């Protein structure tokens, strides 16, 4: 009803009873501020929950604010529902009590379904721009000071320069001279034509190089753009690993890993390759944009290179 004309928002439906525990009752207009709701695309109910928790209460899920085992979020088939399951969520009152020490007005917000404004300590009506960043989370790298309006980047040259015979370009079209290029996209010209919100089709083959040429809109904050891109990291970039030949390379547009999902996904991917780099070629104009470069798909157990990518992101984003 709130959901009329929507085919792929079962993730928003599964959330309804979860949000209701924090007094939250989303209108259609409020769901419209989640982009995959507006464009009616498949999404993770857990990433969405994290994102709403930030917007509402200035904290992400790691705070435990929704850790009560009240309502399950489950995936039967490939859609979300509330079918019985150990993966349970719900406003946790003990955590609210503990947090009210630092945020005395938070109990009121989770009772009202209003926003707890981290900047002012007061209540507010919903708007996605009040709590831009979760305050319980130590970001693992710096974020840009400024974001401007630049022309879209072109990575043809960068992909050409990579070792590899066969290339799968995912998302936007890219011509890559000297390489055999398959194009995966919902565009009708595509070599393999598919809905990308469903992820990489199991039926696509293996490649020496996969390029995820997918971007996410900057709307109002670096953190916002990085968290909106996360579902794409998971559905495309992470699945790309199952379509690499031994020693192949995965390359992906990105905005860092400010949010917890992205950080989890990038780590899962990085630990499968001999090398993990962050590059920002002289073609990447947008300030928040980077390429994640994973070379040497070998799935050998090695030691954790985590501060390397963070340092590099930090230097990039502060300009250093």
Coordinates of N, CA and C in Angstrom, one line a residue, residues 75-166:
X75 N 15.9 -14.6 4.4 CA 15.9 -14.7 2.9 C 15.4 -16.0 2.4
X76 N 14.1 -16.1 2.2 CA 13.6 -17.3 1.6 C 13.6 -17.1 0.1
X77 N 14.3 -18.0 -0.6 CA 14.5 -17.9 -2.1 C 15.6 -16.8 -2.3
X78 N 15.2 -15.7 -2.9 CA 16.0 -14.5 -3.1 C 15.3 -13.2 -2.7
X79 N 14.3 -13.3 -1.8 CA 13.7 -12.1 -1.3 C 13.6 -12.1 0.3
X80 N 13.5 -11.0 0.8 CA 13.4 -10.8 2.3 C 12.0 -11.0 2.8
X81 N 11.9 -11.7 4.0 CA 10.6 -11.7 4.7 C 10.9 -11.9 6.2
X82 N 9.8 -12.1 7.0 CA 9.9 -12.2 8.5 C 9.7 -13.7 8.9
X83 N 9.9 -14.6 8.0 CA 9.8 -16.0 8.4 C 10.8 -16.4 9.5
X84 N 10.3 -17.3 10.4 CA 11.2 -17.7 11.6 C 12.6 -18.0 11.3
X85 N 13.5 -17.5 12.1 CA 14.9 -17.5 11.8 C 15.8 -17.0 13.0
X86 N 17.0 -17.4 13.1 CA 17.8 -16.9 14.2 C 18.3 -15.4 14.0
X87 N 18.2 -14.9 12.7 CA 18.7 -13.6 12.4 C 17.7 -12.6 12.8
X88 N 17.6 -12.3 14.1 CA 16.6 -11.4 14.6 C 17.0 -10.0 15.1
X89 N 16.1 -9.1 14.9 CA 16.3 -7.7 15.2 C 15.2 -7.0 15.9
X90 N 15.4 -5.9 16.6 CA 14.4 -5.2 17.3 C 15.0 -4.3 18.3
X91 N 14.4 -3.1 18.5 CA 14.9 -2.1 19.5 C 15.2 -2.9 20.8
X92 N 16.4 -2.6 21.3 CA 16.9 -3.2 22.5 C 16.9 -2.1 23.6
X93 N 16.0 -2.3 24.6 CA 15.9 -1.3 25.7 C 17.0 -1.2 26.6
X94 N 17.7 -2.3 26.9 CA 18.9 -2.2 27.8 C 20.0 -1.3 27.1
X95 N 20.2 -1.4 25.8 CA 21.1 -0.6 25.1 C 20.7 0.9 25.1
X96 N 19.4 1.1 25.0 CA 18.9 2.5 25.0 C 19.2 3.1 26.3
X97 N 18.9 2.4 27.4 CA 19.3 2.8 28.8 C 20.8 3.1 28.9
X98 N 21.6 2.2 28.4 CA 23.1 2.5 28.5 C 23.5 3.7 27.7
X99 N 22.9 3.9 26.5 CA 23.2 5.0 25.7 C 22.7 6.4 26.1
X100 N 21.6 6.3 26.9 CA 20.9 7.5 27.4 C 21.8 8.3 28.3
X101 N 22.8 7.6 28.9 CA 23.8 8.3 29.7 C 24.5 9.3 28.9
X102 N 25.0 9.0 27.7 CA 25.6 10.0 26.8 C 24.6 10.8 26.0
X103 N 23.5 10.2 25.7 CA 22.4 10.9 24.9 C 21.1 10.9 25.6
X104 N 21.0 11.7 26.7 CA 19.7 11.7 27.4 C 18.4 11.8 26.7
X105 N 18.4 12.3 25.5 CA 17.1 12.4 24.8 C 16.8 11.2 23.9
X106 N 17.7 10.3 23.7 CA 17.5 9.1 22.9 C 16.3 8.2 23.3
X107 N 16.1 8.1 24.6 CA 14.9 7.3 24.9 C 13.6 7.9 24.3
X108 N 13.5 9.2 24.4 CA 12.3 9.8 23.8 C 12.2 9.5 22.3
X109 N 13.3 9.6 21.5 CA 13.3 9.4 20.1 C 12.9 8.0 19.7
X110 N 13.4 7.0 20.4 CA 13.1 5.6 20.1 C 11.7 5.2 20.5
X111 N 11.1 6.1 21.4 CA 9.7 5.9 21.8 C 8.7 6.5 20.8
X112 N 9.2 7.6 20.2 CA 8.3 8.4 19.4 C 8.4 8.1 17.9
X113 N 9.5 7.4 17.5 CA 9.8 7.2 16.1 C 10.3 8.5 15.5
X114 N 10.8 9.4 16.3 CA 11.4 10.6 15.8 C 13.0 10.5 15.6
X115 N 13.6 11.5 15.0 CA 15.1 11.5 14.9 C 15.7 12.1 16.1
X116 N 16.8 11.4 16.5 CA 17.7 11.9 17.5 C 18.8 12.7 16.8
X117 N 18.8 14.0 17.0 CA 19.7 14.9 16.3 C 21.0 14.9 17.1
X118 N 22.0 14.1 16.6 CA 23.3 14.1 17.2 C 24.0 15.5 17.4
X119 N 23.7 16.4 16.5 CA 24.4 17.7 16.6 C 23.8 18.5 17.8
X120 N 22.5 18.4 18.0 CA 21.8 19.2 19.0 C 21.3 18.5 20.2
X121 N 21.3 17.2 20.2 CA 20.7 16.4 21.3 C 19.2 16.4 21.4
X122 N 18.5 17.1 20.5 CA 17.1 17.1 20.5 C 16.4 16.2 19.5
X123 N 15.1 16.1 19.6 CA 14.3 15.4 18.7 C 14.1 16.3 17.4
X124 N 13.7 15.6 16.3 CA 13.4 16.2 15.0 C 12.5 15.3 14.2
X125 N 11.8 15.9 13.2 CA 11.1 15.1 12.2 C 12.1 14.5 11.2
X126 N 11.7 13.4 10.6 CA 12.6 12.7 9.7 C 13.1 13.6 8.5
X127 N 14.4 13.4 8.2 CA 15.0 14.0 7.0 C 16.4 13.2 7.0
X128 N 16.8 12.7 5.8 CA 18.0 11.9 5.7 C 19.3 12.7 5.9
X129 N 19.3 14.0 6.2 CA 20.5 14.8 6.2 C 21.0 15.3 7.5
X130 N 20.2 14.9 8.6 CA 20.5 15.3 9.9 C 21.7 14.6 10.6
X131 N 21.6 13.2 10.6 CA 22.7 12.4 11.0 C 23.4 11.8 9.8
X132 N 24.4 12.5 9.4 CA 25.2 12.1 8.2 C 26.1 10.9 8.4
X133 N 26.6 10.8 9.7 CA 27.7 9.8 9.9 C 27.4 9.1 11.3
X134 N 27.5 7.8 11.5 CA 27.3 7.2 12.8 C 28.4 7.5 13.8
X135 N 28.0 8.0 14.9 CA 29.0 8.5 15.9 C 29.6 7.4 16.8
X136 N 29.0 6.2 16.8 CA 29.6 5.1 17.5 C 30.8 4.4 16.8
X137 N 31.0 4.7 15.5 CA 31.9 4.0 14.6 C 33.1 4.8 14.4
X138 N 34.3 4.2 14.6 CA 35.6 4.8 14.2 C 35.7 4.5 12.7
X139 N 35.6 5.6 11.9 CA 35.8 5.4 10.5 C 37.2 4.8 10.3
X140 N 37.4 3.9 9.3 CA 38.7 3.4 9.2 C 39.7 4.2 8.3
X141 N 39.1 5.2 7.6 CA 40.0 6.2 6.9 C 39.3 7.5 6.9
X142 N 40.0 8.5 6.5 CA 39.4 9.9 6.3 C 38.4 10.0 5.1
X143 N 37.6 11.0 5.2 CA 36.6 11.3 4.1 C 36.9 12.7 3.5
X144 N 36.5 12.9 2.3 CA 36.9 14.2 1.7 C 36.3 15.4 2.4
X145 N 37.0 16.5 2.3 CA 36.4 17.8 2.8 C 35.4 18.4 1.9
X146 N 35.7 18.3 0.6 CA 34.9 18.9 -0.5 C 34.5 17.8 -1.6
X147 N 33.3 18.0 -2.1 CA 32.8 17.2 -3.3 C 32.3 18.2 -4.3
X148 N 32.7 18.1 -5.5 CA 32.3 19.0 -6.6 C 31.7 18.2 -7.8
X149 N 31.3 19.0 -8.8 CA 30.7 18.5 -9.9 C 31.7 18.4 -11.1
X150 N 32.2 17.2 -11.4 CA 33.2 17.0 -12.4 C 32.6 16.1 -13.5
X151 N 33.2 16.0 -14.7 CA 32.7 15.1 -15.7 C 33.0 13.7 -15.3
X152 N 32.1 12.8 -15.7 CA 32.3 11.3 -15.4 C 33.7 10.8 -15.9
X153 N 34.2 10.0 -15.1 CA 35.6 9.4 -15.3 C 35.5 8.4 -16.5
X154 N 36.6 8.3 -17.2 CA 36.8 7.2 -18.2 C 38.0 6.3 -17.9
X155 N 37.8 5.0 -17.8 CA 38.8 4.1 -17.4 C 39.3 3.2 -18.5
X156 N 38.9 3.5 -19.7 CA 39.4 2.7 -20.9 C 40.9 2.4 -20.8
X157 N 41.7 3.5 -20.6 CA 43.1 3.4 -20.7 C 43.7 2.5 -19.6
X158 N 43.1 2.7 -18.4 CA 43.5 2.0 -17.2 C 43.3 0.4 -17.3
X159 N 42.1 0.1 -17.9 CA 41.8 -1.4 -18.1 C 42.7 -2.0 -19.2
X160 N 43.0 -1.2 -20.3 CA 43.9 -1.6 -21.4 C 45.2 -2.0 -20.9
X161 N 45.7 -1.3 -19.9 CA 47.0 -1.4 -19.3 C 47.1 -2.6 -18.4
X162 N 46.0 -3.3 -18.0 CA 46.0 -4.4 -17.2 C 46.4 -5.7 -17.9
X163 N 47.2 -6.6 -17.3 CA 47.5 -7.9 -17.8 C 46.2 -8.7 -17.9
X164 N 46.0 -9.3 -19.0 CA 44.8 -10.1 -19.2 C 44.3 -10.2 -20.6
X165 N 43.8 -11.3 -21.0 CA 43.2 -11.5 -22.3 C 41.7 -11.1 -22.4
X166 N 41.0 -11.8 -21.5 CA 39.5 -11.7 -21.5 C 39.0 -10.7 -20.5

